[PDB]
Symmetry: C2
Subunit: 326 residues, 2 copies
């Protein structure tokens, strides 16, 4: 029944819905590649922007569960770049106070970040450091909630520093592999593999362009990873079945540590919807030029929804239409 939903909202991408034990409904629409008329299909990989902050949190928790790290550990312990009194837990919940290279509360001009800095030289997480490391802290570590991208870069640098491998290597091995996600990865624009959608930006002048020069050339600890809808489904499944972390650490990651506003809380790298004294969903989302993404696990029905799109907006409206079906 997803097809009608996507058709009505004119969504180019792939949506998925799974109810408990049943096999998923999966539906693709629009083009992965407009020029070449390659339709979006079920196995098409999509960039997910901030959706993959969750994978960063999962990775960080695995290091804690493995006893190589703790949530109280100071950032000074593992990184040179000083951020006084900042702790892992501050970063995980967006309460660290660190300066951001892209404060989404005041700026939405992602592309303009790369006007002077070539985005194709953002290949390692350390390449982001100069973009914010010298800026003043915004507030005392722990003071308030403030969505922060640099904060998840810093976490990525911790994963690397603790593990000794690259962030991408860690996640593809300890998260994608350990959860059966064989069609997912941190792909780079200049080495895009088959069955990968291009991200389309629609412009004030009526024309389109792809997002090749609008995002960091490769995804990282704060966003930009690629998955298929069903690999995202598999990711929720593995998480909720304690296949990625043990029960204690899984539950710690899913704990509403911060209350943001109204029904919205944040855990470790995940959003939480809690209304009338019960959690209705855990969810992630992401928005980039040419990209939008919404995905959720509904504890009540053990439902899973995944909306991937290779356009700038729409996944939310399609997500609402689907969770209604529940």
């Amino acid at each position: 029944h997803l097809h009608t939903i996507m058709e009505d909202w004119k969504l180019s991408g792939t949506a998925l819905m799974k109810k408990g034990e049943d096999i998923p409904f999966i539906a693709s629409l629009g083009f992965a590649n407009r020029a070449e008329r390659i339709p979006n299909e079920h196995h098409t990989r999509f960039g997910i922007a901030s959706g993959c902050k969750l994978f960063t949190a999962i990775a960080i928790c695995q290091l804690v569960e493995a006893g190589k790290l703790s949530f109280d550990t100071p950032l000074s312990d593992w990184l040179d770049a000083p951020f006084p009194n900042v702790t892992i837990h501050h970063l995980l919940t967006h309460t660290s106070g660190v300066p951001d290279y892209f404060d989404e509360e005041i700026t939405d001009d992602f592309e303009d970040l790369w006007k002077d800095v070539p985005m194709y030289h953002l290949r390692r997480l350390k390449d982001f450091l100069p973009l914010f490391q010298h800026a003043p802290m915004k507030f005392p570590p722990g003071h308030r909630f403030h969505y922060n991208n640099a904060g998840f870069i810093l976490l990525g640098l911790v994963v690397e520093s603790v593990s000794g491998v690259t962030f991408q290597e860690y996640v593809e091995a300890n998260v994608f592999q350990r959860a059966g996600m064989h069609e997912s990865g941190y792909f780079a624009f200049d080495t895009l593999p088959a069955k990968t959608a291009l991200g389309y930006i629609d412009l004030e002048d009526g024309s389109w362009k792809t997002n090749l020069y609008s995002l960091p050339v490769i995804g990282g600890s704060d966003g930009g990873a690629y998955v298929t809808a069903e690999d995202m489904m598999k990711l929720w499944l593995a998480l909720m079945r304690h296949e990625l972390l043990n029960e204690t650490y899984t539950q710690k990651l899913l704990t509403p540590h911060v209350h943001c506003e109204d029904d919205d809380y944040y855990g470790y790298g995940v959003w939480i919807k809690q209304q009338d004294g019960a959690i209705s969903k855990y969810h992630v989302m992401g928005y980039d030029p040419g990209v939008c993404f919404h995905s959720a696990f509904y504890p009540t029905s053990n439902g899973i929804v995944v909306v991937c799109a290779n356009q700038s907006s729409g996944a939310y409206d399609v997500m609402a239409a689907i969770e209604a079906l529940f």
Copy 2:
């Protein structure tokens, strides 16, 4: 259906499209390899390829049209049209690579400068306009890319439209080239090959971050092989310039070395007191290109490729047929 070009391309492992036309005959055309490796989209006859410096010829035709039109002289100082100063440099010096101006080249290149913000010829000036002249204009031949950027800027200044608009309208359209264009990487149309760079470790990457985002007057235009054939035909038939100006373009104004001479934006092979071919060529990351016209036989060869080398050997192999 197979022809002998397929065999040549296969022998040299050339990914692209090649073309041969003998006088008035129907051309032979052949494609091999992938326009897009990951998607396994095959190169076909109507695939467009970047041709790097191959399009310096389009720049020279454009300039000649303006001169033929009476809006400009080959002896016109650059200072009559451009503000960036290059003292004593004439249009003619630029067209023959004898102007002595500084060059931007010469990517350590786009390591500092985002290649995606080179969308207008104007965006190149900062890369060379402040550097010192190399030698007195007219003094010496030295192949210069910035030189053709300046010529593009002259075309814009004289015509009042963008270089790309001018060429598409007065060159491509006037030649019947309906499938050619100055495409940008972030807006590539259908039937366009990606440029592949083959690394030592056996892998590949596309050239999306290795060239200026859009082609211009020193190189980077896209054509099909048959469009390029059509370009040579319209040129030689005096459809882009009258006979006087076609012949000025094709004149060996400079002896470079041995049998190699240069006219206006075109290479000239002259041996034993006779010219055997007018030709152009281009090499960029993930691009190579060779095309010639053979006056002695009215022969045309076009070799477009979406890989870094090999177009020369296919070309040499096809011309050994004339």
